[PDB]
vacuolar protein sorting-associated protein 28 (Saccharomyces cerevisiae), 99 residues
Amino acid sequence: HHHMFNAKYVAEATGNFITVMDALKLNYNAKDQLHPLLAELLISINRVTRDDFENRSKLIDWIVRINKLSIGDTLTETQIRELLFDLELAYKSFYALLD
């Protein structure tokens, strides 16, 4: 079949998904840690497709939330778990777009 997406872009987006997930697991919880990571993830996703796939908007929601943190203010342990869960769902919906 026809493959509509650039495979280098997808490899990068995929790597960025896993990166942020690992960072989360290594207890990165502050704006200065998480914001550059989420931001590059979103840039990388958009390079593959601008389609507003399921759960993509949550990622934007988290970026705006994390951006509002004061320096030294962190995400709560439970918010971290929520973020990791949203990133998995967004990954899965991304993956499903791929062909």
Q: What stands out?
A: The two ends are 8 Å apart (CA to CA). The helical segments are 7-25, 31-48, 56-68, 77-97. Residues 1-99 form a domain with the Four Helix Bundle (Hemerythrin (Met), subunit A) fold (CATH 1.20.120.1130).
